[PDB]
Amino acid sequence: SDPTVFHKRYLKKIRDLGEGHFGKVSLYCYDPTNDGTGEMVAVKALKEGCGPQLRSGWQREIEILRTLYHEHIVKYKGCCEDKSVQLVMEYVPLGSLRDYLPRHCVGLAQLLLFAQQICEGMAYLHAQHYIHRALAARNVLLDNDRLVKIGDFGLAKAVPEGHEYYRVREDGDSPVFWYAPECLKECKFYYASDVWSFGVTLYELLTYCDSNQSPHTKFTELIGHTQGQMTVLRLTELLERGERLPRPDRCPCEIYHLMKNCWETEASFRPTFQNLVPILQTAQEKYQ
Ligand SMILES: O=C(Nc1n[nH]c2ccc(-c3ccc(NS(=O)(=O)c4cccc(Cl)c4)cc3)cc12)c1ccco1
């Protein structure tokens, strides 16, 4: 049989795994032969209420993941056709860094190794000419042997042929607290804009995804209670002014400087994912 065809009749829902604004990801057992064991798979589906523009983007998302092959990117397994389409990916037993970090003992060197694998997947993603737009700890997953896998591509976009950015409009609903000022102000999401999001993800790693130190709580503390384009505006006001997330508790200064370098106001002055890989390898070596 075609390894990419999953018939609904052999899919059995275990539990939910994650929920975004547009999609839902659940764990299923695939057992065509009713053998008791079966194969565990993650199935992502578009929520009811997504209009034709979201439905088209959903087709492009499935196609982007079909295309990506990297050790630090969640593997595409196939599709489940109804009348709607569900995206079948591999099951990664350790979950997201947002759910793994608050309850596990993770030393600085292992945190830096996690950050490195993110960069490796991210450098491959940028080489294939794609931007991610949602690089947050919650979208980074751990497989067997704590092997990192970027797990969600819902906002990923193809960067046109010879361009350094994709023009993407209005949304105070998107991960705005992980966003560089240039895509908040100019609606231009550069390759360097994803590097800014890495800096925030590294901050999340160093705060062990502590909800009290979270970008939401820290930026809500400054901006207050805001929604939509009001959040986008108030944040832009803070960022190009020079305001950045604080140095997390127990974070060595040189790591915070790495965060700050990913947070340069001028997009062209931020390191590339290609440059970040050896920097983190050395940082990883420095501590144990
Ligand atoms: O989670 C597991 N196992 C997985 N195996 N395979 C997977 C593929 C993707 C996800 C996944 C990806 C992203 C998010 N973030 S989000 O909730 O904010 C979100 C954002 C945007 C869209 C959607 Cl839909 C969800 C959550 C889960 C998880 C697994 C797991 C947990 C414990 C052990 O194992």
Residue numbers in the entry: 883 to 964, 968 to 1173
Paper text:
Janus kinases (Jaks) have broad roles in immune regulation via their action in cytokine signalling. These non-receptor tyrosine kinases phosphorylate receptor chains, which in turn recruit and phosphorylate members of the Signal Transducer and Activator of Transcription (STAT) family. Tyk2 functions together with Jak2 in the signaling of IL-12 and IL-23 via its interaction with the IL-12Rβ1 receptor chain, and in the coordinated phosphorylation of STAT3 & STAT4. Here we present the first mouse Tyk2 crystal structures, which are complexed to 3-aminoindazole compounds.
We also present the structure of Compound 2 complexed to mouse Tyk2, which was solved using inhibitor soaking methods. The placement of this moiety is guided by the sulfonamide linkage’s stabilizing interactions with the NH backbone of Glu898 in the glycine-rich loop, and conserved residues Asn1021 and Arg1020. The structure of Tyk2 and Compound 2 is illustrated in Figure 5b. The binding mode and trajectory of the chlorophenyl is identical to that of Compound 1 and, as a result, the glycine-rich loop adopts the same conformation in both structures. The furan substituent on the hinge-binding 3-aminoindazole core was well-ordered, providing clear evidence that the inhibitor soak was successful. The furan occupies the extended hinge region, sandwiched between Arg894 and Gly977. In the mouse Tyk2 structures, complexed to either Compound 1 or Compound 2, the steric bulk of the sulfonamide chlorophenyl moiety occupies substantial hydrophobic space under the glycine-rich loop and would potentially disrupt the His/Asp “glycine-rich loop lock,” thereby creating a larger active site pocket. Compound 2 (30 μM) significantly increased resistance to partial proteolysis by thermolysin. However, the rate of degradation of the enzyme to smaller forms (<27 kDa) is reduced by 13-fold. Like all protein kinases, the ATP binding site for Tyk2 is nestled between the N-terminal and C-terminal lobes. Our proteolysis data suggest that the conformational flexibility of the kinase, other than a ~2 kDa portion of one terminus (likely the N-terminus based on the disorder seen from residue 870–884 in the crystal structure described below), is decreased by the binding of these 3-aminoindazole inhibitors. We obtained crystals with a kinase-inactive form of the mouse Tyk2 catalytic domain, only in the presence of an ATP-competitive 3-aminoindazole inhibitor. This crystal form provided a robust inhibitor soaking platform that enabled structure-based drug design of Jak inhibitors.
